[PDB]
Amino acid sequence: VCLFLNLANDPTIERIITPRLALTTAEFLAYQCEKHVLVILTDMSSYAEALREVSAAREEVPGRRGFPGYMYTDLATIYERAGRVEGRNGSITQIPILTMPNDDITHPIPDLTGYITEGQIYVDRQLHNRQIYPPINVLPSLSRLMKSAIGEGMTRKDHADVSNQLYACYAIGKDVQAMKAVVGEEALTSDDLLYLEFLQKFERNFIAQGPYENRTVYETLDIGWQLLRIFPKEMLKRIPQSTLSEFYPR
Amino acid sequence: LVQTQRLKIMEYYEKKEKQIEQQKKIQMSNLMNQARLKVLRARDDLITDLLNEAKQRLSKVVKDTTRYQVLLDGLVLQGLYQLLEPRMIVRCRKQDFPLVKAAVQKAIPVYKVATKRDVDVQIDQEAYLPEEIAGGVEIYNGDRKIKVSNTLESRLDLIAQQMMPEVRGALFGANANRKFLD
Amino acid sequence: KDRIEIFPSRMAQTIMKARLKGAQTGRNLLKKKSDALTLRFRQILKKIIETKMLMGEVMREAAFSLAEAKFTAGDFSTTVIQNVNKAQVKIRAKKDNVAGVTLPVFEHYHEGTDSYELTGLARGGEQLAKLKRNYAKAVELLVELASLQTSFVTLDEAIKITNRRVNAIEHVIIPRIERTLAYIITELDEREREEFYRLKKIQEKKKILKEKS
Amino acid sequence: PGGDFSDPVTSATLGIVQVFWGLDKKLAQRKHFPSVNWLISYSKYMRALDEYYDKHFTEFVPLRTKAKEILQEEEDLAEIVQLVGKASLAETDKITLEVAKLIKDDFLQQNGYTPYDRFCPFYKTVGMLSNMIAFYDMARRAVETTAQSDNKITWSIIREHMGEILYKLSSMKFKDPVKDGEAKIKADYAQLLEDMQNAFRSLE
């Protein structure tokens, strides 16, 4: 790791050349030394509060919500420094991090980040209060290039069919999770108990990790399968039958 | 239940054993970290002493005069072209007044054929550059508000910092992983 | 009726985004509480017609015993209408809820009196008890039908109120909170625009002050 | 300007500070005093204090992990407890509404001019939570192992039977930390634990 630490009490112009020092280092290390670089930019909503401060101290007139009018092509000069290149063996993958004020999504710092970048991760608050680490919500989160990062010869053959099966059973359980409070436990059948018993083990074994437990991706499927054995093979609709024969019985 | 009262004590002593083994890797990481820093400082000391040898070999030319008068023709006319003021003022050392003066006099016609300007450039006989410097001049404007540091110590500092990729590429070898340059 | 009275500001945008969000969580309860009550409402209809077809059976097999007292004892109807003081079956009410609304359900009870233990002591009383068993397990059925049609009309009135309360949020309350949201994002675009020009106009007046010097 | 995180002063303080002792105006007319919210209030000095708590107090972090959770499971119940109303409910949830109520009137409840609640020493502060979490886990372990076997119980057979246990667990906040001795308060909380370990063994 090559760490660029820009403090809060340091000048607000030095926060604007910080992600550009970090991405020129990443473009030396990847496109001239053929490394695979992961570029984590922490609190990109604090970049745009230092860009708004540098812009108004340049005697410019603000735009929408007080942010500069060139804010779309200012984040784009940061975010679009990514991707693989033709003829070289390196790449740059970016993970920005945002802080949504008042959990707003129409704020122009998450609005333009979701306008250039591909998906989101959605660290959730209702999981942090329930003491789950890492508190990552699954239902709204999305990776728009996830269907190309998986598969045979990239991760493993069932990574497509496992993930969308755990996504369906996480959604159907969270309807049963609210429905159980409305009607009670004596009114739920042996169908809506398989989804509430899975839901007590998806949040405490798949989502719950602990800060020092590096689950490799071959071990996040065996975790993901021994939750899919709470259901029989007559219930798993999102998995095709050819890989159900190869991975369910163990 | 005799099985159970082992494990509630075993969990109090698997937890302590996962702890010191983490404490073992902190000590090994804090020493490998200062390993790269102590060897990066022993690469910085070899550089900052290579410039000390280039600061002493620079002062073996200011003892010379046939090789320094032809150098001070460069440093003065490099300053009179940067300012381009109608009245400039040159500072120098105490004993280096004729080598600066004979460089000034050869420069004002060579100035005028190159710039189509006229100048009244004269050497300051009141305030000197301090004798602890290694040579060169300083050229001021008329009221001493814009100055050009063309000393030799401020020229070695400018030259070497823009040659730090090239001296690294020649001293310590090439980068073993750098495939391209663009 | 078309806007909730508030004036456009930054704080009043988050309060009408929270009240809209604080209404969509209320409707999400009431959208499924009605269907959870409709989940029990189909099962009572999946019980009432099935119980009605057992009613057609028990009032035949016990009605095939109505001759088995009348082919034997002739007519004894003057006994049962002139000799009766205290009945045997009693009814006690019991509440048994589902999903926040209660349902009063009828329960069987066993009193310990009978004004018919000496009936048939002259000719025969064994054929009466053959009918008497056949009519008592009709009331051991018809206490369940009479309890099934009384939990129908409690879930028939509690569903027809909740719906008028999901629709009173979908068509009255939540559109009024949305239209005042679409007026705060409009009128504050206007207050940024009038302060776009005013911060620009003071800049040219600083340029008029600097070309003078 | 009325309790928001929309103004540029409140939202640009929470991006800088580490502790937020978040107070609200709705939770003030309960005469609770403080107006603690414990949903938007945080502290990011839990990782720095994992060495002080584990060395000097060595027990508190798992009780603090549980006590923040019991007050959270009450919230996602309380919207249905208002609308539906305690009718067809599980009996493990009735623990985390009555034990959770015992926290919200005897642990997070204060009154600042009184001779017992102007100072709260920390060994008495962990001494009160050492009993309240133990009563929660013993109510949970009772209701889950006696859920299928024979003579399944609810909560409403315990709180009538153990009404005198819930008086000693409610008279911890009224013991004076100022007149009483330093070790006069831990032994009372260590004698009460054997009136909480033996008391459950009077029902089973």
JSON list of C-alpha atoms in Angstrom, two decimals, chain B:
[
{"chain": "B", "resi": 1, "resn": "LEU", "atom": "CA", "xyz": [-21.57, -31.53, 30.56]},
{"chain": "B", "resi": 2, "resn": "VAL", "atom": "CA", "xyz": [-18.02, -32.57, 31.46]},
{"chain": "B", "resi": 3, "resn": "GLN", "atom": "CA", "xyz": [-17.33, -31.90, 27.77]},
{"chain": "B", "resi": 4, "resn": "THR", "atom": "CA", "xyz": [-18.91, -28.44, 28.17]},
{"chain": "B", "resi": 5, "resn": "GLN", "atom": "CA", "xyz": [-16.83, -27.21, 31.10]},
{"chain": "B", "resi": 6, "resn": "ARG", "atom": "CA", "xyz": [-13.64, -27.81, 29.14]},
{"chain": "B", "resi": 7, "resn": "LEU", "atom": "CA", "xyz": [-14.68, -25.63, 26.18]},
{"chain": "B", "resi": 8, "resn": "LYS", "atom": "CA", "xyz": [-15.83, -22.62, 28.22]},
{"chain": "B", "resi": 9, "resn": "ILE", "atom": "CA", "xyz": [-12.32, -22.64, 29.67]},
{"chain": "B", "resi": 10, "resn": "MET", "atom": "CA", "xyz": [-10.79, -23.63, 26.31]},
{"chain": "B", "resi": 11, "resn": "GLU", "atom": "CA", "xyz": [-12.44, -20.57, 24.72]},
{"chain": "B", "resi": 12, "resn": "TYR", "atom": "CA", "xyz": [-10.67, -18.47, 27.37]},
{"chain": "B", "resi": 13, "resn": "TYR", "atom": "CA", "xyz": [-7.38, -20.01, 26.22]},
{"chain": "B", "resi": 14, "resn": "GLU", "atom": "CA", "xyz": [-7.89, -20.28, 22.50]},
{"chain": "B", "resi": 15, "resn": "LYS", "atom": "CA", "xyz": [-8.65, -16.54, 22.72]},
{"chain": "B", "resi": 16, "resn": "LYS", "atom": "CA", "xyz": [-5.38, -15.81, 24.53]},
{"chain": "B", "resi": 17, "resn": "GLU", "atom": "CA", "xyz": [-3.53, -17.96, 21.97]},
{"chain": "B", "resi": 18, "resn": "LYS", "atom": "CA", "xyz": [-5.04, -16.15, 19.02]},
{"chain": "B", "resi": 19, "resn": "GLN", "atom": "CA", "xyz": [-3.91, -12.97, 20.79]},
{"chain": "B", "resi": 20, "resn": "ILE", "atom": "CA", "xyz": [-0.14, -13.39, 21.25]},
{"chain": "B", "resi": 21, "resn": "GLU", "atom": "CA", "xyz": [0.25, -14.90, 17.78]},
{"chain": "B", "resi": 22, "resn": "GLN", "atom": "CA", "xyz": [-1.23, -11.63, 16.51]},
{"chain": "B", "resi": 23, "resn": "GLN", "atom": "CA", "xyz": [1.20, -9.90, 18.90]},
{"chain": "B", "resi": 24, "resn": "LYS", "atom": "CA", "xyz": [4.02, -11.91, 17.32]},
{"chain": "B", "resi": 25, "resn": "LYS", "atom": "CA", "xyz": [3.22, -10.58, 13.85]},
{"chain": "B", "resi": 26, "resn": "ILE", "atom": "CA", "xyz": [3.09, -6.96, 15.04]},
{"chain": "B", "resi": 27, "resn": "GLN", "atom": "CA", "xyz": [6.73, -7.20, 16.16]},
{"chain": "B", "resi": 28, "resn": "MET", "atom": "CA", "xyz": [7.75, -8.80, 12.86]},
{"chain": "B", "resi": 29, "resn": "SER", "atom": "CA", "xyz": [5.87, -6.14, 10.89]},
{"chain": "B", "resi": 30, "resn": "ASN", "atom": "CA", "xyz": [7.18, -3.17, 12.87]},
{"chain": "B", "resi": 31, "resn": "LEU", "atom": "CA", "xyz": [10.73, -4.35, 12.18]},
{"chain": "B", "resi": 32, "resn": "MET", "atom": "CA", "xyz": [10.23, -5.08, 8.49]},
{"chain": "B", "resi": 33, "resn": "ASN", "atom": "CA", "xyz": [8.70, -1.60, 8.19]},
{"chain": "B", "resi": 34, "resn": "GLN", "atom": "CA", "xyz": [11.74, 0.18, 9.63]},
{"chain": "B", "resi": 35, "resn": "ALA", "atom": "CA", "xyz": [13.84, -2.19, 7.54]},
{"chain": "B", "resi": 36, "resn": "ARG", "atom": "CA", "xyz": [12.64, -0.55, 4.32]},
{"chain": "B", "resi": 37, "resn": "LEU", "atom": "CA", "xyz": [13.02, 2.90, 5.87]},
{"chain": "B", "resi": 38, "resn": "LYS", "atom": "CA", "xyz": [16.56, 2.33, 7.17]},
{"chain": "B", "resi": 39, "resn": "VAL", "atom": "CA", "xyz": [17.56, 1.09, 3.72]},
{"chain": "B", "resi": 40, "resn": "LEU", "atom": "CA", "xyz": [15.78, 4.02, 2.04]},
{"chain": "B", "resi": 41, "resn": "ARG", "atom": "CA", "xyz": [17.73, 6.40, 4.24]},
{"chain": "B", "resi": 42, "resn": "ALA", "atom": "CA", "xyz": [20.97, 4.66, 3.25]},
{"chain": "B", "resi": 43, "resn": "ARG", "atom": "CA", "xyz": [20.01, 5.43, -0.33]},
{"chain": "B", "resi": 44, "resn": "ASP", "atom": "CA", "xyz": [19.31, 9.07, 0.53]},
{"chain": "B", "resi": 45, "resn": "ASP", "atom": "CA", "xyz": [22.63, 9.57, 2.30]},
{"chain": "B", "resi": 46, "resn": "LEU", "atom": "CA", "xyz": [24.55, 8.39, -0.77]},
{"chain": "B", "resi": 47, "resn": "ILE", "atom": "CA", "xyz": [22.68, 10.99, -2.84]},
{"chain": "B", "resi": 48, "resn": "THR", "atom": "CA", "xyz": [23.06, 13.95, -0.46]},
{"chain": "B", "resi": 49, "resn": "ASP", "atom": "CA", "xyz": [26.80, 13.21, -0.26]},
{"chain": "B", "resi": 50, "resn": "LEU", "atom": "CA", "xyz": [27.11, 12.91, -4.04]},
{"chain": "B", "resi": 51, "resn": "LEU", "atom": "CA", "xyz": [25.88, 16.50, -4.14]},
{"chain": "B", "resi": 52, "resn": "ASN", "atom": "CA", "xyz": [28.44, 17.42, -1.49]},
{"chain": "B", "resi": 53, "resn": "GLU", "atom": "CA", "xyz": [31.12, 16.15, -3.85]},
{"chain": "B", "resi": 54, "resn": "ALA", "atom": "CA", "xyz": [29.48, 18.18, -6.62]},
{"chain": "B", "resi": 55, "resn": "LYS", "atom": "CA", "xyz": [29.58, 21.18, -4.27]},
{"chain": "B", "resi": 56, "resn": "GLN", "atom": "CA", "xyz": [33.32, 20.78, -3.69]},
{"chain": "B", "resi": 57, "resn": "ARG", "atom": "CA", "xyz": [34.17, 20.02, -7.32]},
{"chain": "B", "resi": 58, "resn": "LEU", "atom": "CA", "xyz": [32.19, 23.14, -8.18]},
{"chain": "B", "resi": 59, "resn": "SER", "atom": "CA", "xyz": [34.54, 25.19, -5.99]},
{"chain": "B", "resi": 60, "resn": "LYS", "atom": "CA", "xyz": [37.56, 23.70, -7.76]},
{"chain": "B", "resi": 61, "resn": "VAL", "atom": "CA", "xyz": [36.45, 25.68, -10.82]},
{"chain": "B", "resi": 62, "resn": "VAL", "atom": "CA", "xyz": [36.10, 29.04, -9.06]},
{"chain": "B", "resi": 63, "resn": "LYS", "atom": "CA", "xyz": [39.81, 28.81, -8.19]},
{"chain": "B", "resi": 64, "resn": "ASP", "atom": "CA", "xyz": [40.38, 28.79, -11.94]},
{"chain": "B", "resi": 65, "resn": "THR", "atom": "CA", "xyz": [40.06, 31.96, -14.01]},
{"chain": "B", "resi": 66, "resn": "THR", "atom": "CA", "xyz": [40.38, 30.96, -17.68]},
{"chain": "B", "resi": 67, "resn": "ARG", "atom": "CA", "xyz": [37.61, 28.42, -17.08]},
{"chain": "B", "resi": 68, "resn": "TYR", "atom": "CA", "xyz": [35.55, 30.71, -14.85]},
{"chain": "B", "resi": 69, "resn": "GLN", "atom": "CA", "xyz": [35.58, 33.94, -16.87]},
{"chain": "B", "resi": 70, "resn": "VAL", "atom": "CA", "xyz": [34.03, 31.99, -19.75]},
{"chain": "B", "resi": 71, "resn": "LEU", "atom": "CA", "xyz": [31.45, 30.64, -17.29]},
{"chain": "B", "resi": 72, "resn": "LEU", "atom": "CA", "xyz": [30.56, 34.07, -15.86]},
{"chain": "B", "resi": 73, "resn": "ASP", "atom": "CA", "xyz": [29.87, 35.23, -19.40]},
{"chain": "B", "resi": 74, "resn": "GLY", "atom": "CA", "xyz": [27.04, 32.71, -19.34]},
{"chain": "B", "resi": 75, "resn": "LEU", "atom": "CA", "xyz": [25.55, 33.45, -15.93]},
{"chain": "B", "resi": 76, "resn": "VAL", "atom": "CA", "xyz": [25.35, 37.22, -16.36]},
{"chain": "B", "resi": 77, "resn": "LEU", "atom": "CA", "xyz": [23.84, 37.20, -19.84]},
{"chain": "B", "resi": 78, "resn": "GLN", "atom": "CA", "xyz": [21.44, 34.49, -18.68]},
{"chain": "B", "resi": 79, "resn": "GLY", "atom": "CA", "xyz": [20.23, 37.00, -16.11]},
{"chain": "B", "resi": 80, "resn": "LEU", "atom": "CA", "xyz": [20.09, 40.06, -18.36]},
{"chain": "B", "resi": 81, "resn": "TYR", "atom": "CA", "xyz": [17.82, 38.10, -20.70]},
{"chain": "B", "resi": 82, "resn": "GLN", "atom": "CA", "xyz": [15.45, 36.99, -17.95]},
{"chain": "B", "resi": 83, "resn": "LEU", "atom": "CA", "xyz": [14.78, 40.46, -16.50]},
{"chain": "B", "resi": 84, "resn": "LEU", "atom": "CA", "xyz": [14.80, 42.67, -19.64]},
{"chain": "B", "resi": 85, "resn": "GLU", "atom": "CA", "xyz": [14.70, 45.88, -17.62]},
{"chain": "B", "resi": 86, "resn": "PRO", "atom": "CA", "xyz": [16.20, 49.17, -18.84]},
{"chain": "B", "resi": 87, "resn": "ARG", "atom": "CA", "xyz": [18.49, 49.40, -15.78]},
{"chain": "B", "resi": 88, "resn": "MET", "atom": "CA", "xyz": [19.85, 46.29, -14.06]},
{"chain": "B", "resi": 89, "resn": "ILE", "atom": "CA", "xyz": [22.28, 45.90, -11.16]},
{"chain": "B", "resi": 90, "resn": "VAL", "atom": "CA", "xyz": [24.70, 43.00, -10.63]},
{"chain": "B", "resi": 91, "resn": "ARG", "atom": "CA", "xyz": [25.86, 41.79, -7.22]},
{"chain": "B", "resi": 92, "resn": "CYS", "atom": "CA", "xyz": [28.92, 39.60, -6.75]},
{"chain": "B", "resi": 93, "resn": "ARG", "atom": "CA", "xyz": [31.67, 38.78, -4.27]},
{"chain": "B", "resi": 94, "resn": "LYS", "atom": "CA", "xyz": [34.45, 41.09, -3.08]},
{"chain": "B", "resi": 95, "resn": "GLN", "atom": "CA", "xyz": [37.44, 39.61, -4.91]},
{"chain": "B", "resi": 96, "resn": "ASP", "atom": "CA", "xyz": [35.31, 38.53, -7.89]},
{"chain": "B", "resi": 97, "resn": "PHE", "atom": "CA", "xyz": [34.70, 42.08, -9.12]},
{"chain": "B", "resi": 98, "resn": "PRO", "atom": "CA", "xyz": [36.96, 42.11, -12.26]},
{"chain": "B", "resi": 99, "resn": "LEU", "atom": "CA", "xyz": [35.81, 38.67, -13.45]},
{"chain": "B", "resi": 100, "resn": "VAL", "atom": "CA", "xyz": [32.24, 39.96, -13.17]},
{"chain": "B", "resi": 101, "resn": "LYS", "atom": "CA", "xyz": [33.13, 43.35, -14.66]},
{"chain": "B", "resi": 102, "resn": "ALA", "atom": "CA", "xyz": [34.97, 41.88, -17.65]},
{"chain": "B", "resi": 103, "resn": "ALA", "atom": "CA", "xyz": [31.91, 39.66, -18.12]},
{"chain": "B", "resi": 104, "resn": "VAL", "atom": "CA", "xyz": [29.53, 42.64, -17.93]},
{"chain": "B", "resi": 105, "resn": "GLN", "atom": "CA", "xyz": [31.47, 44.66, -20.53]},
{"chain": "B", "resi": 106, "resn": "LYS", "atom": "CA", "xyz": [31.53, 41.80, -23.04]},
{"chain": "B", "resi": 107, "resn": "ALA", "atom": "CA", "xyz": [27.78, 41.35, -22.62]},
{"chain": "B", "resi": 108, "resn": "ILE", "atom": "CA", "xyz": [26.11, 44.73, -23.19]},
{"chain": "B", "resi": 109, "resn": "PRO", "atom": "CA", "xyz": [26.83, 44.89, -26.95]},
{"chain": "B", "resi": 110, "resn": "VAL", "atom": "CA", "xyz": [26.03, 41.15, -27.20]},
{"chain": "B", "resi": 111, "resn": "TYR", "atom": "CA", "xyz": [22.79, 42.01, -25.38]},
{"chain": "B", "resi": 112, "resn": "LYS", "atom": "CA", "xyz": [21.91, 44.88, -27.74]},
{"chain": "B", "resi": 113, "resn": "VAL", "atom": "CA", "xyz": [22.32, 42.89, -30.96]},
{"chain": "B", "resi": 114, "resn": "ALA", "atom": "CA", "xyz": [20.02, 40.19, -29.57]},
{"chain": "B", "resi": 115, "resn": "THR", "atom": "CA", "xyz": [17.20, 42.21, -27.99]},
{"chain": "B", "resi": 116, "resn": "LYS", "atom": "CA", "xyz": [17.11, 45.65, -29.74]},
{"chain": "B", "resi": 117, "resn": "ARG", "atom": "CA", "xyz": [17.04, 47.20, -26.25]},
{"chain": "B", "resi": 118, "resn": "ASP", "atom": "CA", "xyz": [19.26, 49.64, -24.35]},
{"chain": "B", "resi": 119, "resn": "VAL", "atom": "CA", "xyz": [20.44, 49.01, -20.80]},
{"chain": "B", "resi": 120, "resn": "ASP", "atom": "CA", "xyz": [22.30, 50.83, -18.05]},
{"chain": "B", "resi": 121, "resn": "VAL", "atom": "CA", "xyz": [23.68, 47.83, -16.16]},
{"chain": "B", "resi": 122, "resn": "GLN", "atom": "CA", "xyz": [26.16, 48.54, -13.38]},
{"chain": "B", "resi": 123, "resn": "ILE", "atom": "CA", "xyz": [27.80, 46.59, -10.60]},
{"chain": "B", "resi": 124, "resn": "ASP", "atom": "CA", "xyz": [26.81, 47.25, -6.99]},
{"chain": "B", "resi": 125, "resn": "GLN", "atom": "CA", "xyz": [29.91, 48.40, -5.10]},
{"chain": "B", "resi": 126, "resn": "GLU", "atom": "CA", "xyz": [28.19, 48.76, -1.70]},
{"chain": "B", "resi": 127, "resn": "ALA", "atom": "CA", "xyz": [26.52, 45.41, -0.91]},
{"chain": "B", "resi": 128, "resn": "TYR", "atom": "CA", "xyz": [28.35, 42.18, -1.71]},
{"chain": "B", "resi": 129, "resn": "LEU", "atom": "CA", "xyz": [27.32, 38.58, -1.97]},
{"chain": "B", "resi": 130, "resn": "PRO", "atom": "CA", "xyz": [28.62, 36.83, 1.16]},
{"chain": "B", "resi": 131, "resn": "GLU", "atom": "CA", "xyz": [31.96, 35.10, 0.66]},
{"chain": "B", "resi": 132, "resn": "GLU", "atom": "CA", "xyz": [30.71, 31.72, 1.93]},
{"chain": "B", "resi": 133, "resn": "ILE", "atom": "CA", "xyz": [28.87, 31.17, -1.39]},
{"chain": "B", "resi": 134, "resn": "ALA", "atom": "CA", "xyz": [30.61, 29.25, -4.15]},
{"chain": "B", "resi": 135, "resn": "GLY", "atom": "CA", "xyz": [30.44, 31.77, -6.99]},
{"chain": "B", "resi": 136, "resn": "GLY", "atom": "CA", "xyz": [28.03, 33.27, -9.48]},
{"chain": "B", "resi": 137, "resn": "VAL", "atom": "CA", "xyz": [26.12, 36.54, -9.39]},
{"chain": "B", "resi": 138, "resn": "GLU", "atom": "CA", "xyz": [22.73, 38.04, -8.61]},
{"chain": "B", "resi": 139, "resn": "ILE", "atom": "CA", "xyz": [21.11, 40.50, -11.03]},
{"chain": "B", "resi": 140, "resn": "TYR", "atom": "CA", "xyz": [18.59, 43.00, -9.70]},
{"chain": "B", "resi": 141, "resn": "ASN", "atom": "CA", "xyz": [16.38, 45.48, -11.48]},
{"chain": "B", "resi": 142, "resn": "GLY", "atom": "CA", "xyz": [16.60, 49.25, -11.06]},
{"chain": "B", "resi": 143, "resn": "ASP", "atom": "CA", "xyz": [14.96, 49.60, -7.64]},
{"chain": "B", "resi": 144, "resn": "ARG", "atom": "CA", "xyz": [15.88, 46.07, -6.46]},
{"chain": "B", "resi": 145, "resn": "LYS", "atom": "CA", "xyz": [12.33, 44.67, -6.56]},
{"chain": "B", "resi": 146, "resn": "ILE", "atom": "CA", "xyz": [12.84, 41.79, -9.03]},
{"chain": "B", "resi": 147, "resn": "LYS", "atom": "CA", "xyz": [15.98, 39.73, -8.56]},
{"chain": "B", "resi": 148, "resn": "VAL", "atom": "CA", "xyz": [17.55, 36.81, -10.41]},
{"chain": "B", "resi": 149, "resn": "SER", "atom": "CA", "xyz": [19.63, 34.36, -8.39]},
{"chain": "B", "resi": 150, "resn": "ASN", "atom": "CA", "xyz": [22.29, 33.14, -10.81]},
{"chain": "B", "resi": 151, "resn": "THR", "atom": "CA", "xyz": [24.76, 31.99, -8.16]},
{"chain": "B", "resi": 152, "resn": "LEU", "atom": "CA", "xyz": [26.43, 28.64, -8.65]},
{"chain": "B", "resi": 153, "resn": "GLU", "atom": "CA", "xyz": [24.88, 27.10, -5.53]},
{"chain": "B", "resi": 154, "resn": "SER", "atom": "CA", "xyz": [21.37, 27.97, -6.71]},
{"chain": "B", "resi": 155, "resn": "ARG", "atom": "CA", "xyz": [22.25, 26.68, -10.17]},
{"chain": "B", "resi": 156, "resn": "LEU", "atom": "CA", "xyz": [23.45, 23.30, -8.89]},
{"chain": "B", "resi": 157, "resn": "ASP", "atom": "CA", "xyz": [20.26, 22.99, -6.86]},
{"chain": "B", "resi": 158, "resn": "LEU", "atom": "CA", "xyz": [18.09, 23.61, -9.93]},
{"chain": "B", "resi": 159, "resn": "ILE", "atom": "CA", "xyz": [20.09, 21.34, -12.25]},
{"chain": "B", "resi": 160, "resn": "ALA", "atom": "CA", "xyz": [20.43, 18.30, -9.99]},
{"chain": "B", "resi": 161, "resn": "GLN", "atom": "CA", "xyz": [16.77, 18.08, -8.94]},
{"chain": "B", "resi": 162, "resn": "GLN", "atom": "CA", "xyz": [15.77, 17.91, -12.61]},
{"chain": "B", "resi": 163, "resn": "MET", "atom": "CA", "xyz": [18.39, 15.19, -13.18]},
{"chain": "B", "resi": 164, "resn": "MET", "atom": "CA", "xyz": [17.25, 12.95, -10.32]},
{"chain": "B", "resi": 165, "resn": "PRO", "atom": "CA", "xyz": [15.60, 10.41, -12.67]},
{"chain": "B", "resi": 166, "resn": "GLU", "atom": "CA", "xyz": [18.79, 10.27, -14.72]},
{"chain": "B", "resi": 167, "resn": "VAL", "atom": "CA", "xyz": [21.25, 9.87, -11.85]},
{"chain": "B", "resi": 168, "resn": "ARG", "atom": "CA", "xyz": [19.01, 7.20, -10.32]},
{"chain": "B", "resi": 169, "resn": "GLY", "atom": "CA", "xyz": [18.88, 5.37, -13.65]},
{"chain": "B", "resi": 170, "resn": "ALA", "atom": "CA", "xyz": [22.67, 5.40, -13.87]},
{"chain": "B", "resi": 171, "resn": "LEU", "atom": "CA", "xyz": [23.69, 4.80, -10.24]},
{"chain": "B", "resi": 172, "resn": "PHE", "atom": "CA", "xyz": [21.30, 2.14, -8.95]},
{"chain": "B", "resi": 173, "resn": "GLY", "atom": "CA", "xyz": [20.37, 0.43, -12.21]},
{"chain": "B", "resi": 174, "resn": "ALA", "atom": "CA", "xyz": [17.13, 0.36, -14.13]},
{"chain": "B", "resi": 175, "resn": "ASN", "atom": "CA", "xyz": [13.73, -0.49, -12.71]},
{"chain": "B", "resi": 176, "resn": "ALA", "atom": "CA", "xyz": [13.45, -4.27, -12.95]},
{"chain": "B", "resi": 177, "resn": "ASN", "atom": "CA", "xyz": [9.67, -4.15, -13.49]},
{"chain": "B", "resi": 178, "resn": "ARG", "atom": "CA", "xyz": [9.18, -1.00, -15.58]},
{"chain": "B", "resi": 179, "resn": "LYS", "atom": "CA", "xyz": [8.35, -2.21, -19.08]},
{"chain": "B", "resi": 180, "resn": "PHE", "atom": "CA", "xyz": [7.40, 1.07, -20.76]},
{"chain": "B", "resi": 181, "resn": "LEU", "atom": "CA", "xyz": [8.19, 4.77, -20.43]},
{"chain": "B", "resi": 182, "resn": "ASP", "atom": "CA", "xyz": [5.24, 6.69, -21.91]}
]
